[PDB]
Amino acid sequence: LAHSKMVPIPAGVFTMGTDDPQIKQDGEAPARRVTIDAFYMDAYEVSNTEFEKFVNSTGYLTEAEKFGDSFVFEGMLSVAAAPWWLPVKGANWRHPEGPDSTILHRPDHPVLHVSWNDAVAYCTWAGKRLPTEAEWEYSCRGGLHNRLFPWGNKLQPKGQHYANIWQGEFPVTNTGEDGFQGTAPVDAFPPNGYGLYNIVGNAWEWTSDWWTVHHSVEETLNPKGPPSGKDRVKKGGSYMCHRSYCYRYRCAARSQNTPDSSASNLGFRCAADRLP
Numbered sequence: 001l002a003h004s005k006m007v008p009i010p011a012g013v014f015t016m017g018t019d020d021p022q023i024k025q026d027g028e029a030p031a032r033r034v035t036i037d038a039f040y041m042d043a044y045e046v047s048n049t050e051f052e053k054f055v056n057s058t059g060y061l062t063e064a065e066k067f068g069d070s071f072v073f074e075g076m077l078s079v080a081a082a083p084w085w086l087p088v089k090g091a092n093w094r095h096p097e098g099p100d101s102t103i104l105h106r107p108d109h110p111v112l113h114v115s116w117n118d119a120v121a122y123c124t125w126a127g128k129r130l131p132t133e134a135e136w137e138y139s140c141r142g143g144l145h146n147r148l149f150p151w152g153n154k155l156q157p158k159g160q161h162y163a164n165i166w167q168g169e170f171p172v173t174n175t176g177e178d179g180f181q182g183t184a185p186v187d188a189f190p191p192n193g194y195g196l197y198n199i200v201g202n203a204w205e206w207t208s209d210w211w212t213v214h215h216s217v218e219e220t221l222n223p224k225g226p227p228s229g230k231d232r233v234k235k236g237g238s239y240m241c242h243r244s245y246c247y248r249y250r251c252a253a254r255s256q257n258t259p260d261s262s263a264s265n266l267g268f269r270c271a272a273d274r275l276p
């Protein structure tokens, strides 16, 4: 396993956002042309094993461990956003559903219950950083223009599952049709054109930017988002998403959380300007 490998993301110009927003309240619009300098992006979400190497090196205690709780989706059980999100005492990256759960059987799955601060700590320890939202989105799009997904516009191209999201009736029944009810290994499913895995679906992914929904149509170069805010931007959707209630497994989709937030469907990957 080379689950910390990076890929070179080529320099280019791309259309960020969409003039056909699917969740208008999220500021998916307007479409805008963005220039991105060549950089490196992690091929994989950061895994449990990779995060454990960081904790072993540094002794880092995550925010969820210090607070003593984290959000867990009710459907995984053996001050919430929805009735299916429960603050669970003792839920954290080593104990993803609570104190009696474990990561021993899922070392290669994405690390969960990591806050934005935890993610920055990891990436910086690794000689990396979080990607900006624009870098993330450019990378997600995998060299295609104005597509819904990393691979195109069909959810199941050639009848194949291309990402780990929900099938069935959310939140009561996840059929596991795509092979995974919860997370999948970080190297599951096909890569996109740049070499990236699970950039939509599996775990949500933190980015560096402060959240706003007010964007200019002006062309920009390596944008970093607004200089201030209260929530940081997360991208890509998770194993929970479904067209019926949370259609956020699109590269243009976007959501947010306070930087000290953590949950059972939220992880990250790193980026870098040059190879560490």
Ligand SMILES: *[C@@H]1O[C@H](CO)[C@@H](O[C@@H]2O[C@H](CO)[C@@H](O)[C@H](O)[C@H]2NC(C)=O)[C@H](O)[C@H]1NC(C)=O
Binding pocket: 049, 050, 052, 053, 056
């Ligand atoms: C994190 O550190 C732990 C603790 O030292 C490592 O787990 C140990 O690994 C060795 C070698 O396989 C075993 O002999 C020890 O008994 C393990 N400790 C116990 C009791 O769990 C672990 O491999 C490190 N994690 C990573 C991802 O490198």
Ligand SMILES: [Ca+2]
Binding pocket: 164, 165, 166, 167, 176, 177, 178, 179, 180, 181, 182, 239
């Ligand atoms: Ca699934």
Ligand SMILES: [Ca+2]
Binding pocket: 045, 198, 199, 200, 201, 202, 203, 204, 205, 236, 237
């Ligand atoms: Ca993901």
Ligand SMILES: [Cl-]
Binding pocket: 017, 018, 146, 147, 148, 252
């Ligand atoms: Cl789009």
